[PDB]
Design a protein around this ligand. Structure first.
Ligand code: KX0
Ligand code: KX0
Ligand code: KX0
Ligand code: KX0
Ligand code: CL
Lengths: 277, 283, 285, 275
């Protein structure tokens, strides 16, 4: 039923299972070592993303689309790479890179052995760079939340959850099935997405980073949240982040999409900060 | 955002917060004692289940919860379907107040009894989940998600259907293929919904057959040993799950009947209510 | 060596072959004149077209004819459908004879007369004959799976006749006929349920009939114009349906849309199509 | 929708659509100017594409045909793949263009009542013969060898074509191949052998020597099996020299081991051209 790209395909037999990394509602993945993925005969360890016993058709449609999305994006230091994809006789298995420390939100939450401010800027800098590569490839993430951004072993940040991604190169969905708190007003109300919306989500992502994994829009119910955005309630600055970042961070959250800064602008703005810290 | 249902609204202050009865991936429900709701105008506390969106939320998830409140008001009351005691639409975050089932949901109700359950008792639940469906489909609605995991058993064991938020009104046009197929789990879905993208009343009966399978083989997963990806390939082939152990052939023939390839020829929901009534009567 | 059917047999000596009329992937038909083939008109030569194996013969083709011949025996005579007149089944080559329509297959014939002259009433009238023809098949519990405009032969004086019966199969006790999957059918004229669920029925035929009206209405135009077969599946799930032809009246177009309903239970059955068409037909003058 | 092989894929924009070049009931082939190939120049190619009446099974046959072509490689005397469009949009499989079409027609349109002489008739046989030789040792077999499925190349170079019914090396359905060109060994027991094609080749030789005349003239397909079951063999064509007639008999040998091997046939033919 599912055709196999020759370059991506990997034999089912070669791969070996490991203790499951996680079992989310979105998808199930099991850590595993796959040998000779590149053949160099190296038994690399790759997390595998796969379906649950009961899978929604949209999940089936989404994971497969997520696998396809990885092929288009070029290998980049920040975005999580796809090393090999399996579409054998058995159930579809996707092989991804393994990030030893888990997602960004959970990594900071476990460091409230300490996180110096320079590292926080560095963590922020890498995300901008990743988005910049995606912008060049015209891919829009649609999430950009700390909770699905894998931070790898030796602290190099990695973007993740490309299942929701679409290739940009307005009206295919109402921009539902996405976390509202991390979602842009333009997408929320008019159901269209653009690079700016990721930047707004990225603006929310910065609060996740600067609140040491803290949840955004504290004390506000999602139903209530529709109203504040129209009137302009933007969250106050996190303690650790310096004031200069806030003007940039707040600028990302804008009423009109055109005003919001593009990624090229953000990385360049961010590159200097690391230098003077 | 939210209007006013004078009969439906229940003030936030009257209802009391409680320990959570599970946190679903889609939404969170927390137990509550409803001071305000009146069994017969007592104004005495009655236990209840509050269903609320958890703060991290899907864009659709807010909509689905709102749809669930809207869907239930239209349905009315039947002894085989979950009640709809209250809503807190007027203020704060949406809170939906729905009656509580002591025994819990049917799928795990059966797994934990693999206690003693007589064969007929099992027929009774299957017979019952059929009476409820008949009323539900006689109100020009398609539940669209029938599965054991969503049939809730009350204390004293009276089966109540749940998760009504997904099902859509089919009153004058029968759910043409608008859907993008993210609506339902593949294992419990009908083939026409899976392939054609059309859902009719009959598709609940295809789903109902799997519900008969789950109930009959002690809350067991269907299409076991078969990956979802591979499932589609033999659905066209027509291979179907075999009769669960200790199930009478007559129920199995009824089960296979539900599994008819042609939606038009599947047993009508009235027939299912009618047969089981005869079947159950013998013993 | 096939078993003889006494009624169908037609002596080889009586039949004397004539020049060939087109070629197909199922074999070929050569015009022939058979003496007194039609009962109640004995000792007369009535032109007949004989379906015979192509010099190069597909094994499926040999089997195909045998099956095709069997279908003719069961359907029974009808003014609007091609009818078996006789058959050659004995020792030697197997010639199967079938009625000869002077004008030819309908889609091409229409393509003959796009501004010859064809008035709108004839186009509506022509559809009525096909709908009536289909009803007999529905009544006789058989389904013509490949019901498309190109295969409908129209006779001299326009008595439209159905054709290319090898695909159609009996449904005496089982309605779906779900066993056959993707063996040999056009995607564009296939119904949606059958294409995806591998089930065919009479409501399923009407969808093929639905398209057949469109081909006929726009002078034998190809169905689903400008859209490739490969990408047809995606639009079909989404609900795209071809637009009404410029020639078409609104009333016919609603029936066309009516014949394309997603749910088979909902589409009209052939009795309704013939009845609805008859009224529309009545007001033509 | 379909996995794209990087080597084979050719961008849709690059190849101008062009116009029709003959037709077949199963699929449609249309000539086109395909810029590029590693010439880096624009030259004509015939792309085979799904026809309007798309059979459900027809799509599978097209994919199999593309697959067959990929493994074979390139030979002088056999039509070989020139890359295919693949994943984006509609699927067109591209093959090399032949100028004069199928050989059977080419021979018919060269019957008197510069026509080919006897050496030219022999020359076609050698080419066709060597091509089977190239195909031979690839662990592949054509399964349908006849004049129509053989395509001449502008400037007279013969190329075997229409590779869909080939399975690179007996559970096959064996419904879709013609009775007359089928090997007796193959038709009756449904067995398929690399050298079972010599009979097909033996029949093919006959088409060339009578400039395309239909094989077993006067014998209907229905009655054909009986003659094959008993001892029988097509008559030697008038144009062909007697030495060839025996080759056909040798090619038609009752048991598969006995039919001359493709190297043998090709080697035997060379002497004849050489002589
Ligand atoms: C797909 C993928 N690729 N790489 C991954 C990974 N998934 C996650 C993950 C975490 C929570 C929820 C969902 C998921 Cl999918 C992950 C989790 N825990 C890791 N850790 C092991 C060692 O110690 C700390 C914990 C590592 C991970 N990395
Ligand atoms: C919406 C609703 N209405 N009524 C409900 C209820 N939700 C559930 C539930 C069950 C499975 C998955 C999700 C959910 Cl939300 C529930 C769970 N467990 C119960 N039991 C308490 C006492 O101990 C045994 C267990 C009772 C429940 N009742
Ligand atoms: C089986 C049969 N029965 N009757 C037939 C007939 N076959 C055909 C035919 C047509 C299209 C495709 C396939 C076929 Cl087989 C036919 C063709 N051409 C005719 N005409 C000759 C004189 O010029 C005008 C045209 C007449 C025909 N009649
Ligand atoms: C695969 C391929 N490669 N090259 C091809 C070609 N297909 C054919 C062909 C022939 C018979 C049956 C099927 C087919 Cl598909 C072809 C036919 N006729 C040509 N002629 C053009 C000029 O006028 C006389 C006719 C040219 C052709 N070229
Ligand atoms: Cl139906």
């Amino acid at each position: 039923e599912l055709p196999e790209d020759p370059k991506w395909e990997f034999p089912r037999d070669k791969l070996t299972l490991g203790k499951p990394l996680g079992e989310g509602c979105f998808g199930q993945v099991v850590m595993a070592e796959a040998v000779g993925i590149d053949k160099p005969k190296e038994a690399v360890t790759v997390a595998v993303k796969m379906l649950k016993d009961d899978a929604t058709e949209k999940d089936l449609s989404d994971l497969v689309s997520e696998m396809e999305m990885m092929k288009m994006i070029g290998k980049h230091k920040n975005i999580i790479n796809l090393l090999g994809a399996c579409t054998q006789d058995g159930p579809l298995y996707v092989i991804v890179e393994y990030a030893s420390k888990g997602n960004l939100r959970e990594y900071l939450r476990a460091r409230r052995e300490q996180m110096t401010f320079k590292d926080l800027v560095s963590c922020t800098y890498q995300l901008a760079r990743g988005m910049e590569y995606l912008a060049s490839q015209k891919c829009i993430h649609r999430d950009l939340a700390a909770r699905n951004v894998l931070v790898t072993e030796n602290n190099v940040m990695k973007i993740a959850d490309f299942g929701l991604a679409r290739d940009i190169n307005y009206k295919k969905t109402t921009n539902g099935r996405l976390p509202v708190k991390w979602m842009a007003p333009e997408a929320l109300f008019d159901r269209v997405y653009t690079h700016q919306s990721d930047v707004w989500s990225f603006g929310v992502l910065m609060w996740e980073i600067f609140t040491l994994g803290g949840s955004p829009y504290p004390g506000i119910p999602v139903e209530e949240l529709f109203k504040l955005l129209k009137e302009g309630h933007r969250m106050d600055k996190p303690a650790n982040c310096t004031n200069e970042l806030y003007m940039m961070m707040r600028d990302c959250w804008h009423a009109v999409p055109s005003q919001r800064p593009t990624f090229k602008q953000l990385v360049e703005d961010l590159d200097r900060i690391l230098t003077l810290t």
